Amino acid sequence: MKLNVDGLLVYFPYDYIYPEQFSYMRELKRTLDAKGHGVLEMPSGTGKTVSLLALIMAYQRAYPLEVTKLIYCSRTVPEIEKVIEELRKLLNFYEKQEGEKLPFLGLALSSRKNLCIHPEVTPLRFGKDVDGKCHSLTASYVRAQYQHDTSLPHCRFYEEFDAHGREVPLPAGIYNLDDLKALGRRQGWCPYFLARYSILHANVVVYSYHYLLDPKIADLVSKELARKAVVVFDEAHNIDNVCIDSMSVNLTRRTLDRCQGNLETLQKTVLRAEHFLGFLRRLLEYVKWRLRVQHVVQESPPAFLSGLAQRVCIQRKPLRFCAERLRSLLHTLEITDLADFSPLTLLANFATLVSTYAKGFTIIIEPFDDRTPTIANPILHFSCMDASLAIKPVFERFQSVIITSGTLSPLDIYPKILDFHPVTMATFTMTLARVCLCPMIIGRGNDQVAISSKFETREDIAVIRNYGNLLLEMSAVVPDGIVAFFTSYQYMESTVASWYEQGILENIQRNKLLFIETQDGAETSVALEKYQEACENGRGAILLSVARGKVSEGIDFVHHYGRAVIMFGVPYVYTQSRILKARLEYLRDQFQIRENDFLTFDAMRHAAQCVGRAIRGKTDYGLMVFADKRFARGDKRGKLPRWIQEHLTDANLNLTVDEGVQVAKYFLRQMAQPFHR
C-alpha cells in the first residue's frame, strides 16, 4: 500500500509490510539522502527486490533530477528474469492502483547467444564463437557492402533496424528478454542492437556483474549514460572473488599451440601495419623460454617488462598500442571468424596489463597438474592481487554504490579489502511468528573426541567414524533432504572410502539415498535431477558436495528440499599453488589485513553462504549444523551473519552428536504445526 516514509509516499503491492522491510526502506532513504555509497545485509532472497524497486520508483518520482539511471546487476540469468517479472508485477500494481501510465522503460541485457534470433547459431554451444559469427555476419564492412546488395548469406536484422528501429523509441512498456526477442523478430530487428539503442532512453536496466567489473566491456556498455546514477549489486557476497577473477588470465600448452598454429594463417592472410606484423612474431618465443626452464616459481611483476627488453630489447611503449590494434589491424584484415583466434587476442590484453598494471599484481608460474604434476605443464597465470582495481572505475563514476547480499557479516573488512567509504553499517535480521532456523555447533562426538577437520587429523580414524556416526542418526531425524558440504574433493573421496570400508555407510543407505556431486557438470545435473525427485517422495536422499563448488551457489534449496545443511569442518581454501599466499602478503603490508583473519573470513563466508540457502521464503524452515569445534570459538561465530547470531544460543555450542539429535528432533517436531500469516 501507500507507505508513508518521513518525506515521501511509496506504493507497495503487498498490504502487509514486515518491520525488517520498513527498516530497510528507512536505511535506503537515508543513504539516498546522504548522496553516498553504502553496504546492506538482508536474509531474504525474495521480498528484497520488490521493496528496492518500489523505493527506487518513489525516489525517482519525488526527485527526477537526483536519480536518472538505475542498475540492478545480479549474478546469473534466473536472477535477472525474476527481478524483471517482479518489476512487471510492480508496474501492473501501480497501473491498477493509479490508472495512468508512466514513461518508464525496463530492459534486460545478456550475451549475444542469449539474445539472438538466427536459428543457425542457437543450437551450437560455443560461447566464444557466437560473437565472432555475429560480427562476421554484420559489421562495418557488411554495412558498406550492403549498398551494392551483394548476394551472400548474412544477418539482416541490423539492415532493417538501422532504417526503422533507430527512429521509433519505447517510452513506455517494460520488456523482458523474451519480450525483446519477440519484438525483434516481429519487427525484423536484433534484440542486442535495439537494446544498445534504447539503453540511452530508458529508466531501469538489468544485466550481469561481468558487464561492469570487466574494463573491456564496462566502458562500451556504460560510458556517459548518467553521471549521477544508483547501482546495486544484490547477492554480491563474493564480489571480491569475481573482481579478482576479472583481471585473471591463464596460459597453457593448448593456448601457445593454438597461437603458433594460427600465426601462420594470419601471415598467409597478410601476404595477400608493418609496425605490428613482425612485433608479434617474436613474442611467442619469449614466453616459451619458461617452457624449457624447469623452475618452481618466478615472481617479478616490475622486472617482467624489464626482462622483456633484454632477450629481444623491445621498448615498453608499443605494448600499450596492442589494445587499440584490435579495432584497427584486425578489421582491415577481415578475419573470417574468431575460431582459432581467441588465444591470440588475450595475449595483447596480457601485454597491456603487465605494461600498465603492475603496482598490485604478481606473475606466478606453476608446473603442477592434477595427478600428473611433472610431465609437461609450465602454466603462466597473471593472477590479480588487489580487488580495488576492478572497483575503482565504478566508484568515481557513481554516487550511491550499494553492496548487498545474504552474507555480509563483517562490515569492517570490505571497506579495507577494497577502497570504500561506507556510511551505513546496516544489518537486518528477519523475524517471523516462529524461529525458522535452528543453528547449532557440534563439538566433541559421543566418544568425547573432537571432530574438527584439522589437516593433521584428516587421516585419523577416530574423527572419521564420528562424522559417519553423526550422519547416521541425523539421516533418521530430518527427512526429505540433507545437504552436506566438505572442505575439498580430495577430503570428500577419502571420507566416503573410510565409511565404505567400515560397516557404517550401508546403514545410511537404507535410510536415505547417498548422492555424490562430481566435477562433471552433466553427471552433477542428473545427480541433482534424481535428488529432486527423491526428496519429492518419502524415500529421501543425501546430497554430498564441496563448499567451494559450482553446486554450492548454483542451486537454491527451497523448502522441503534440503531441510538440514551439514558443514563437515571449517572450509579452508588450500594454501598450495602459491596464489593465496601472494594475496595474503599483499594485504599484509598494504591494508594491514591479518593473515589468519582473512583465511577465517574466507572460510566463514563460504560456510555461511551455503548454509544460508536453506531458508528461502517466510514459510520456509530448515536445520543448520556445524560439525567442527572450531566454529564454537568466538572469533568464528562473530563471522556469521547477524540474522543467524541471535538464533545461535550459547547453550548449544559444544554439544555432542547425541545432544544435537535431540535438539533437531525437538525443533522439527514443533515446526510442523500450522501457523498464521
Partner: protein
Amino acid sequence: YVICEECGKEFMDSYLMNHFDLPTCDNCRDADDKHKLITKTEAKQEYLLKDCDLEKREPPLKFIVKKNPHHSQWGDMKLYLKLQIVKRSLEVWGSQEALEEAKEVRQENREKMKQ
C-alpha cells in the same frame, strides 16, 4: 607538505607519516633506536597498557601488521611506535615513577596470589 620535527625540511610523503601520522621524514627516521617497533604484548606488559587505551583513547594509536621474522607458524605480529606507546603510558599513568610503582605492586600482588 609536512615539516619534519628533526631536520625541518618539508616533505610530502614518508613512511612514518603514512604508518603512524608522525611528522618525520625518512631521512630522520631513526628506526634503529628512537623509532624502534615493539609487539603489542610486549608494550602491554612493560607499560601496563590495556587494549582500550591503545584503541579508544584519543588519538588512536596505529600499528603495522608485519610477518614475524621466524617461521610462518603464526606471525603477522602488530608493531607500534615506541615513542607513541611511551607517550600514551605517560599520559595514562601521569609519570614514569607512577608506572614503576604500579609494576612493583603488580608483581607483589602476583607473589601474594601465588603464595
